[PDB]
Coordinates of C-alpha atoms in Angstrom, one line a residue:
Chain U
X434 CA -90.8 -93.2 -19.4
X435 CA -89.9 -89.8 -21.1
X436 CA -87.8 -87.3 -19.2
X437 CA -87.1 -83.7 -18.9
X438 CA -83.7 -82.7 -17.6
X439 CA -82.6 -80.4 -14.9
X440 CA -79.1 -79.6 -13.7
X441 CA -77.0 -77.6 -11.2
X442 CA -73.4 -77.4 -10.2
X443 CA -72.0 -77.7 -6.7
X444 CA -68.9 -75.6 -6.1
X445 CA -68.6 -75.0 -2.4
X446 CA -65.7 -73.9 -0.1
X447 CA -64.8 -70.9 -2.3
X448 CA -65.7 -67.4 -3.4
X449 CA -66.6 -66.1 -6.8
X450 CA -63.6 -64.0 -7.7
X451 CA -64.1 -61.2 -10.3
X452 CA -60.7 -59.7 -11.1
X453 CA -60.6 -55.9 -11.6
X454 CA -58.3 -56.1 -14.5
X455 CA -58.6 -55.9 -18.3
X456 CA -57.7 -59.4 -19.5
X457 CA -59.1 -60.7 -16.2
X458 CA -55.8 -62.4 -15.4
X459 CA -53.6 -62.4 -12.4
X460 CA -50.6 -60.3 -13.7
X461 CA -49.9 -58.6 -10.3
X462 CA -51.3 -57.2 -7.2
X463 CA -51.4 -53.5 -8.3
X464 CA -53.6 -54.4 -11.2
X465 CA -53.7 -53.4 -14.9
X466 CA -57.0 -51.5 -15.1
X467 CA -56.8 -50.3 -11.5
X468 CA -53.6 -48.2 -11.7
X469 CA -54.8 -45.5 -14.0
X470 CA -56.6 -44.1 -10.9
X471 CA -53.6 -43.7 -8.7
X472 CA -53.6 -39.9 -8.7
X473 CA -57.3 -39.5 -9.7
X474 CA -59.4 -38.3 -6.8
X475 CA -62.4 -39.3 -8.9
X476 CA -65.3 -40.6 -6.9
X477 CA -66.5 -43.6 -8.9
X478 CA -69.7 -45.1 -7.7
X479 CA -70.8 -48.5 -8.7
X480 CA -74.3 -50.0 -8.7
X481 CA -73.3 -53.6 -8.4
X482 CA -76.7 -55.4 -8.3
Chain I
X875 CA -10.7 -54.1 6.3
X876 CA -12.3 -50.7 5.6
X877 CA -10.6 -47.3 6.0
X878 CA -13.6 -45.1 6.9
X879 CA -16.5 -45.8 9.3
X880 CA -19.0 -43.4 7.8
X881 CA -19.0 -45.3 4.5
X882 CA -20.3 -48.3 6.4
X883 CA -22.9 -46.0 7.9
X884 CA -23.7 -45.1 4.3
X885 CA -23.8 -48.8 3.6
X886 CA -26.2 -49.8 6.4
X887 CA -28.7 -46.9 6.3
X888 CA -29.0 -45.9 2.6
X889 CA -31.3 -47.4 0.0
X890 CA -29.4 -49.6 -2.4
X891 CA -31.7 -48.8 -5.3
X892 CA -31.6 -45.2 -6.5
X893 CA -34.2 -43.0 -4.9
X894 CA -34.9 -39.3 -5.3
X895 CA -35.4 -38.7 -1.6
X896 CA -31.6 -38.9 -1.0
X897 CA -29.8 -39.2 -4.3
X898 CA -31.7 -36.8 -6.6
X899 CA -28.9 -36.3 -9.1
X900 CA -28.9 -40.0 -10.0
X901 CA -32.7 -40.5 -9.9
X902 CA -33.3 -37.5 -12.2
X903 CA -30.4 -38.8 -14.3
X904 CA -32.6 -41.7 -15.6
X905 CA -36.0 -40.0 -15.7
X906 CA -35.0 -37.7 -18.6
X907 CA -33.5 -40.8 -20.4
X908 CA -29.9 -39.5 -20.4
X909 CA -27.6 -42.4 -19.3
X910 CA -24.8 -44.2 -21.0
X911 CA -25.6 -47.8 -20.0
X912 CA -29.3 -48.7 -20.8
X913 CA -30.8 -45.3 -21.6
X914 CA -34.3 -46.3 -22.7
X915 CA -35.3 -47.9 -19.4
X916 CA -37.8 -45.5 -17.8
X917 CA -40.5 -45.2 -20.5
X918 CA -41.1 -48.9 -20.3
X919 CA -41.9 -48.9 -16.7
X920 CA -45.7 -48.6 -16.2
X921 CA -47.7 -46.0 -14.2
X922 CA -46.9 -47.7 -11.0
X923 CA -43.1 -47.0 -10.9
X924 CA -43.2 -43.8 -13.0
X925 CA -45.4 -41.7 -10.8
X926 CA -43.7 -43.2 -7.7
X927 CA -40.5 -41.7 -8.9
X928 CA -41.3 -38.8 -11.2
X929 CA -43.4 -37.0 -8.6
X930 CA -40.7 -37.5 -5.9
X931 CA -37.9 -36.1 -8.1
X932 CA -39.3 -32.8 -9.2
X933 CA -40.1 -32.1 -5.5
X934 CA -38.0 -34.1 -3.1
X935 CA -39.0 -35.5 0.3
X936 CA -37.6 -34.0 3.5
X937 CA -36.1 -36.9 5.5
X938 CA -34.2 -36.9 8.8
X939 CA -30.5 -37.8 9.0
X940 CA -30.6 -38.1 12.8
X941 CA -30.7 -41.9 12.6
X942 CA -27.8 -41.9 10.0
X943 CA -25.4 -39.5 11.5
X944 CA -25.2 -41.5 14.7
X945 CA -24.1 -44.6 12.9
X946 CA -21.2 -42.6 11.6
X947 CA -20.3 -42.0 15.2
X948 CA -21.2 -45.4 16.8
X949 CA -19.3 -47.2 14.1
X950 CA -16.3 -44.8 14.6
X951 CA -16.2 -45.6 18.3
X952 CA -16.3 -49.4 17.8
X953 CA -13.7 -49.4 15.1
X954 CA -11.2 -48.0 17.7
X955 CA -12.4 -50.6 20.3
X956 CA -13.8 -47.9 22.6
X957 CA -17.0 -49.9 22.9
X958 CA -17.4 -53.7 22.9
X959 CA -18.9 -55.0 19.7
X960 CA -21.6 -56.8 21.8
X961 CA -22.7 -53.4 23.0
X962 CA -23.3 -51.0 20.0
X963 CA -26.9 -52.0 19.8
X964 CA -27.3 -50.4 23.3
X965 CA -25.4 -47.2 22.7
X966 CA -27.2 -46.4 19.5
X967 CA -30.3 -47.2 21.5
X968 CA -29.0 -44.6 23.9
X969 CA -27.5 -42.0 21.6
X970 CA -30.6 -41.8 19.5
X971 CA -32.6 -41.2 22.7
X972 CA -30.0 -38.6 23.7
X973 CA -29.9 -36.5 20.5
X974 CA -33.7 -36.6 20.2
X975 CA -34.1 -35.5 23.8
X976 CA -31.9 -32.4 23.6
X977 CA -32.3 -31.8 19.9
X978 CA -31.8 -28.4 18.3
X979 CA -30.4 -26.7 15.3
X980 CA -27.0 -26.9 17.1
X981 CA -26.8 -30.6 17.8
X982 CA -27.8 -31.6 14.3
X983 CA -24.9 -29.4 13.2
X984 CA -22.6 -30.5 16.0
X985 CA -22.9 -34.2 15.1
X986 CA -22.0 -33.2 11.5
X987 CA -18.8 -31.6 12.7
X988 CA -18.0 -34.9 14.5
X989 CA -18.6 -37.1 11.5
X990 CA -15.8 -35.3 9.8
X991 CA -12.9 -35.5 12.3
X992 CA -13.6 -39.2 12.6
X993 CA -12.8 -39.2 8.8
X994 CA -10.0 -36.7 8.2
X995 CA -8.7 -36.0 11.7
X996 CA -8.6 -39.7 12.5
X997 CA -5.5 -39.8 10.3
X998 CA -3.6 -39.8 13.6
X999 CA -4.7 -43.4 13.9
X1000 CA -3.3 -44.0 10.4
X1001 CA -0.2 -42.1 11.7
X1002 CA 0.9 -43.9 14.8
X1003 CA 0.4 -47.3 13.2
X1004 CA 3.5 -46.2 11.2
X1005 CA 5.5 -44.2 13.7
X1006 CA 4.2 -46.6 16.4
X1007 CA 4.6 -44.3 19.4
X1008 CA 1.6 -46.2 20.9
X1009 CA 4.3 -48.1 22.8
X1010 CA 7.6 -47.7 21.1
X1011 CA 8.8 -44.1 21.1
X1012 CA 7.2 -42.3 24.1
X1013 CA 7.2 -45.5 26.1
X1014 CA 11.0 -45.9 25.4
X1015 CA 11.8 -42.3 25.9
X1016 CA 11.0 -42.9 29.6
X1017 CA 13.5 -45.8 29.5
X1018 CA 16.2 -43.6 28.0
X1019 CA 15.4 -41.1 30.8
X1020 CA 16.1 -43.9 33.3
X1021 CA 19.5 -45.2 32.2
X1022 CA 22.6 -43.4 33.6
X1023 CA 24.5 -41.5 30.9
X1024 CA 27.8 -41.7 32.8
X1025 CA 29.5 -45.0 31.8
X1026 CA 33.2 -45.2 32.8
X1027 CA 34.5 -47.4 29.9
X1028 CA 33.1 -46.8 26.5
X1029 CA 31.4 -43.4 26.7
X1030 CA 30.7 -43.1 23.0
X1031 CA 29.5 -46.6 22.0
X1032 CA 27.0 -46.6 24.9
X1033 CA 25.0 -43.7 23.2
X1034 CA 25.4 -45.3 19.8
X1035 CA 23.9 -48.6 20.9
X1036 CA 20.7 -47.0 22.2
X1037 CA 20.8 -44.7 19.2
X1038 CA 20.5 -48.0 17.2
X1039 CA 17.8 -49.3 19.6
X1040 CA 15.5 -46.3 19.2
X1041 CA 15.7 -47.0 15.4
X1042 CA 14.7 -50.7 16.1
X1043 CA 11.4 -49.8 17.7
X1044 CA 10.8 -47.1 15.0
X1045 CA 11.3 -49.1 11.8
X1046 CA 9.1 -51.9 13.1
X1047 CA 5.4 -51.1 13.5
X1048 CA 4.6 -54.3 15.5
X1049 CA 7.2 -54.1 18.2
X1050 CA 6.4 -52.2 21.4
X1051 CA 7.8 -51.6 24.9
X1052 CA 5.7 -51.1 28.1
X1053 CA 5.7 -50.7 31.9
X1054 CA 4.8 -53.9 33.7
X1055 CA 6.0 -53.9 37.3
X1056 CA 9.1 -52.0 38.3
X1057 CA 10.9 -52.9 35.0
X1058 CA 10.4 -52.3 31.3
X1059 CA 10.2 -55.0 28.6
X1060 CA 10.4 -55.2 24.8
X1061 CA 8.6 -57.8 22.6
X1062 CA 9.5 -58.0 19.0
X1063 CA 5.9 -58.7 17.9
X1064 CA 2.4 -58.6 19.2
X1065 CA 1.3 -62.3 19.7
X1066 CA 5.0 -62.7 19.9
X1067 CA 7.8 -64.5 21.6
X1068 CA 11.4 -63.2 22.5
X1069 CA 10.5 -60.9 25.3
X1070 CA 13.7 -59.3 26.5
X1071 CA 14.0 -58.2 30.1
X1072 CA 15.2 -54.7 29.1
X1073 CA 16.0 -53.5 32.6
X1074 CA 17.9 -56.7 33.5
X1075 CA 19.8 -56.4 30.2
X1076 CA 21.3 -52.9 30.4
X1077 CA 22.1 -53.5 34.0
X1078 CA 24.1 -56.5 32.7
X1079 CA 25.7 -54.4 30.0
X1080 CA 26.6 -51.7 32.5
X1081 CA 30.3 -52.1 33.4
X1082 CA 30.8 -54.0 30.2
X1083 CA 31.1 -51.5 27.3
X1084 CA 34.9 -51.4 27.5
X1085 CA 36.7 -54.8 27.7
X1086 CA 39.0 -55.1 24.6
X1087 CA 38.7 -58.9 24.9
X1088 CA 40.9 -61.3 22.9
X1089 CA 39.6 -63.7 20.3
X1090 CA 40.4 -66.8 22.2
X1091 CA 37.6 -66.7 24.8
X1092 CA 34.2 -68.2 24.2
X1093 CA 32.8 -70.1 27.3
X1094 CA 33.4 -67.4 30.0
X1095 CA 30.2 -65.3 29.6
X1096 CA 28.0 -67.9 31.3
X1097 CA 28.9 -66.1 34.5
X1098 CA 29.2 -62.7 32.7
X1099 CA 26.4 -62.4 30.2
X1100 CA 22.8 -63.4 30.4
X1101 CA 21.0 -65.2 27.5
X1102 CA 18.3 -62.5 27.2
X1103 CA 21.1 -60.0 26.8
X1104 CA 22.5 -62.5 24.3
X1105 CA 19.0 -62.3 22.7
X1106 CA 18.7 -58.5 22.9
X1107 CA 22.0 -58.4 21.0
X1108 CA 20.4 -60.8 18.5
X1109 CA 17.5 -58.4 18.1
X1110 CA 19.8 -55.4 17.6
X1111 CA 22.0 -57.3 15.1
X1112 CA 20.2 -56.6 11.7
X1113 CA 19.9 -52.8 12.5
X1114 CA 23.5 -52.4 13.4
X1115 CA 26.0 -51.5 10.7
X1116 CA 29.8 -52.1 10.9
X1117 CA 30.5 -48.5 12.2
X1118 CA 28.6 -48.7 15.5
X1119 CA 31.0 -50.8 17.6
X1120 CA 34.0 -51.2 15.4
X1121 CA 36.2 -54.2 15.7
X1122 CA 37.9 -54.9 19.1
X1123 CA 35.3 -54.6 21.9
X1124 CA 33.8 -57.8 23.2
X1125 CA 30.5 -56.6 21.6
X1126 CA 32.5 -56.7 18.3
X1127 CA 33.0 -60.4 19.2
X1128 CA 29.2 -60.5 19.7
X1129 CA 27.3 -58.1 17.5
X1130 CA 29.4 -58.8 14.4
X1131 CA 29.3 -62.5 14.9
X1132 CA 25.5 -62.5 15.5
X1133 CA 25.1 -60.9 12.1
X1134 CA 27.2 -63.7 10.6
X1135 CA 24.9 -66.2 12.4
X1136 CA 21.9 -64.5 10.9
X1137 CA 23.9 -64.3 7.6
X1138 CA 24.1 -68.1 7.6
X1139 CA 20.4 -68.7 7.9
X1140 CA 19.3 -66.0 5.4
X1141 CA 21.0 -68.0 2.6
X1142 CA 20.7 -71.5 4.1
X1143 CA 16.9 -71.1 4.2
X1144 CA 17.1 -70.8 0.4
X1145 CA 19.2 -74.0 0.5
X1146 CA 16.5 -75.6 2.7
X1147 CA 13.8 -74.5 0.2
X1148 CA 15.7 -76.4 -2.5
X1149 CA 16.1 -79.7 -0.5
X1150 CA 12.5 -80.0 0.6
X1151 CA 11.3 -79.5 -3.1
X1152 CA 13.6 -82.1 -4.6
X1153 CA 12.4 -84.9 -2.3
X1154 CA 9.2 -85.0 -4.3
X1155 CA 11.0 -84.4 -7.6
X1156 CA 12.8 -87.7 -7.5
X1157 CA 10.8 -89.6 -4.9
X1158 CA 12.1 -89.6 -1.3
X1159 CA 10.8 -90.7 2.1
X1160 CA 9.2 -87.6 3.6
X1161 CA 10.0 -88.9 7.1
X1162 CA 13.7 -89.1 6.1
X1163 CA 13.5 -85.8 4.2
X1164 CA 14.2 -83.7 7.3
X1165 CA 16.4 -85.7 9.6
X1166 CA 19.5 -85.7 7.4
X1167 CA 18.5 -82.3 6.0
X1168 CA 18.8 -80.4 9.3
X1169 CA 22.0 -82.1 10.3
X1170 CA 23.8 -80.8 7.2
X1171 CA 22.6 -77.2 8.0
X1172 CA 23.1 -77.0 11.8

């Protein structure tokens, strides 16, 4: 009998980590793209939807 | 091992890396890129460790040396054994409570006067390790203010023997005299043997300084001398030249002959160093490398 396909992926026990960096790597704790705002009192908002 | 205690206070409370909060002249020395070894080393640090140093150098922080000035005192008291070493974690836990209780402009400047005379006026502690009047000069000047200066026979050699005994406790930093019980003693070394009973020696030598004894008398002084007096004369022998007690007193039969007995061993030890090194140069039984060696030298 013919067949459509349907698929998912199970990945439990963990988060979804988005790194706030530039190359999205783990270079350090005090990140790459983050540390240009060390002495910037600059109220960034974000509409993460 | 160290000389100064405040350097160890500057080793236990200062940052090892260069910071502009305390050593500005070395932290600004490398921001402007003017250094002999590795000059170009501050541009290539990122915005993390530039602004965390370049802000703090053109306007320094204002820290408190109260916790550091007391370690230059608490160490200076435990170097001289005023406090037990098991105890300095309590007194710094009590001095820091003290000088923060009664703090002022004055006490912060009064500790700073006291972390200087434990540096340059603690040179007395460097002084009487050399002159050793810890227990050798002012503890023996009570002994020379105890002996009677009126000896009937030999008035002149009595005050030249103790003139050579004050030189003994002066040219030796380790030797010291002391008051234990009703009599004074004298040890040639700390952690040392050969304690002479100094009161029971000059009382034996009293009434003895003029004898003019002949040279055919050896085994009489078992009822006349005492072996510690015979050992005190051994300890006065290397610091006694040939002009102290000249030739013909019985101490000239003792002090001159004790220098010859020391004069035997100060060249036969060099002989003994040769014999114990040629037993492994030709091959010799090391058990029988000392039995016949000592019998040739005694």
